[PDB]
Amino acid sequence: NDIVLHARRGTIYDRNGNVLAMSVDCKNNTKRVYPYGNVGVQILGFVNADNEGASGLEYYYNDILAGTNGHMISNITEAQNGQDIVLSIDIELQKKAEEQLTAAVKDFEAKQGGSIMAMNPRTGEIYAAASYPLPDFVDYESLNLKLVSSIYEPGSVFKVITTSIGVDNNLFGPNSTFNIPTELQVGDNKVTDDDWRTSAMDMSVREMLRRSSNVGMAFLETQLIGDKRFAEGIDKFGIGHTTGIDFPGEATGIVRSLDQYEGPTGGNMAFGQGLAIPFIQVIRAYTAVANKGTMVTPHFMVSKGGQEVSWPTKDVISSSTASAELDMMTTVVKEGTGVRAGIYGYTVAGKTGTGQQVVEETGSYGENSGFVASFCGIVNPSESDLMVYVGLNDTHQLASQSAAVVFSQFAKDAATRLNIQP
Template sequence: MRSLRRGGPDFDSNAKFLMVFVAVLAAIVAGKLVYLQVFEASNLSKQAEAMRTNTVTIQAKRGTIYDRNGNVLAMSQDCTTIYCNPNEVQAGSIEEAAKILAEDTGGDESDFLSILTQDTTFAYLKRKVDNSVADQVKEDLAKANISGVYYLSDVRRVYPYGSVGSQVLGIVGTDGDGLTGLELYYNDILKGTDGEMIFETGSGGTPIAGETAQTKDAKDGTDIVISLDIDIQKVAEETITQGVKDYSADSGSVMVTDPTTGEILAACSTPMFDVTDTSTIEDGATSLKLVSSSFEPGSIFKLLTMAIGIDNGLITPDSTFDVPAKVQVGSDWVGDDDNRSYEMNMSVREILRRSSNAGTALVAQQVIGADTFASGIEKFGIGSKTGIDFPGEVAGIVKTREHYDNASLGAMSFGQSLAIPLVQMVKAVDSIADDGTLTTPHFLVKKGGETVEWKSAGTSVSKETADQVTDMMRTVVQEGTATAAQVDGYDVAGKTGTGEQAGETGSYIENSYVSSLIGFANADDPKVLVYVGLNGTPYLATSSAAPLFSTIMSAALSDLGVEPTSGTSS
């Protein structure tokens, strides 16, 4: 009988295979360990650290916003955020803790109960409360021997003048970033750099409130001074709000500037909102229609048409024309508001005084011409963004010369067949007030204590032209369509505008106008320019925008200490 032998060819083969497999596996494991320990060590360490920690942002204090007179319009105030570790709150103390929190912070007891009973190690109880309120909570919880509630230093935005200027200032979100208005436009300047607090976390990755935390301090933002005068702003807001009601308008807008610098002293459009309570904001309330919406400017545009004609040596204020009752503009016939049926001999001054559509169209079509007109309105900046430091500016819809049709020149000459944000008219008429010098409408005056320079945007017309147009604007206020715009004792230069509004079909809506008035005072040495516009009103400018203009202009002149030129109205 043969004895059994261990091994053999099959055994040897299997053993060798097993040895190779083990060796390869060992090499793979060793390689993986080398890779993890050498190449991935840093990343793995970071991942492990991230699993053990959680970061809470500490908001920086945003820079303070001041008006031109040093009044604080928006500032960041120290406050406290209250949070808890529900697992540390004793079961028998939860209801009492909720009651104390509700009584001290003004919240709802049931809301605090639901937070305090959450299955987590970190939960916010109340964010951004007054420090005095937080101190009271801390004292009352301590008296009740309740633990598990903690406090984090925080900041919030406050507005000493309440809702006044809300539209211009804008909204700051809960994350500390500006969302609208100047808070958005200058967010990078105002925001600063947030800090952070790093908490140890539990097995679920949630921060363990009350454990040792590492804190990186926040760096505060930069203060800015803006051109608003809060007293003029208040009058502008109140006046246009009441005006929209009194004259059955869809909305209204106001802008007040210093025409020699372009600084905006007041600006608003309806509807407005209250930045101290942003729970309900109407559509469009956060934007300035003067900047973000385009309208047909109407007869205030006649100022630019006549300025172009004078500046090119084609007309003077005393040039006269036989103006028929109606003038053909493309396929339409254009007449005046007085519905006269006869021809009149009018000077350019009289055309502006009466605000004659027929006279303006005649001068534009027969004397100025399309090339000169197109070049002239381009010099005024019509159809281009003004560069105003406010979000949402649009350029408007203005035909370039190559796209003019038979009606373009005549219609555009008196403010139809083009749509622009009315800040463009403010910039253009600012230049007439300032001897033809174009300035950029703007809010920012200083940042971090340093004055911000706004360079001239060029020249629209000569000083001689600007003076002649100004003198005709005086006549409009003294004897023409803008008599209701007079301010007792002051020399006011102005022009009314009543622009028809086009409907969705493209045709004009009956008895729906953009009624406006733009003007400045004193005419010889302007310190204030005011634009007032009512959108979608059935009232002509002479009986609606003009008296609103007078109210706002009077308040601005008085507030700025501008001396009257006489003891009676001009």
């Protein structure tokens, strides 16, 4: 004769206080109700029939969201309901992120979907985030956030890390100019740029970034940085380390340590080849450039039990280096491959990338690996309020015509929705 008094799980609020998930006895059982339907459910996760969090934040914070049931046996013990959680997510921005990512995947023929995220580079709070395919009502693979749990060869979006390391080590600056050949031998393979020249070009570090020269990056790493300082910087930037994001399934990635480097490793990694990491690591690294040199922890939960949590930060580069990098990322958007990411009335510092799909458990790939088109940008970098990432997986269209285009529209909407006026 032991009756269960079912506790209710804690409520999940978005940043404006909208209820995203709440438990109800209309189930005797309890069930979650998601008022905005499928919007943000990928982040929220689902709760199964045993009322256990099964994916997303429901799972990640299940021990605090789940209460403790009561029991009626002449003896009664109280149900303790779970603790409420407030997230950084702006539900209306989440809806746009989802619809824009879905439309982009369709328009640019991204055969393996993509991801999108808007975050505050100073506090680390995530305003919106999504991966395609998205779930509804259910395919278990759509419950992951690809940004966190899938790994890719990052490609050219990584060049901001390589230049930051050099600059922060005082080995060159934006205007430093070098005679860059058409190709360079790295290990036993040649590095080349897809371009017009048939001769070496004198290019400043700023220019190598503007045009995204792989050859220039490999030159910088091999002739100026050196593998040791390179590998130390990668490590300081958190590359190959989990970011600490509060979401399940975070991949650490596959990144060679210095003692495992071989002939071509450093040169290739300089332009984002020879490692495979989740894009959340790239995003996290960019926060250092956007936040005066301090890298933050991307995250969803702002408060639990009315207790605001402190999230770890790390000083990676100086503010001067961060400023020189932002200056160059601004050239990318004003004068280079990122020009379609520009947004009328705002300053956008960013970088395009062409990355690759990889064998998930090894980080390598063959001839038919699909390309990943990415764009990562910071809006009004002096305000420290917004950075957005857009990635399209297995598309044939260049990041300059695809991911950068999606960013201009979504980052604009993120900026209107938030404080950001210009």
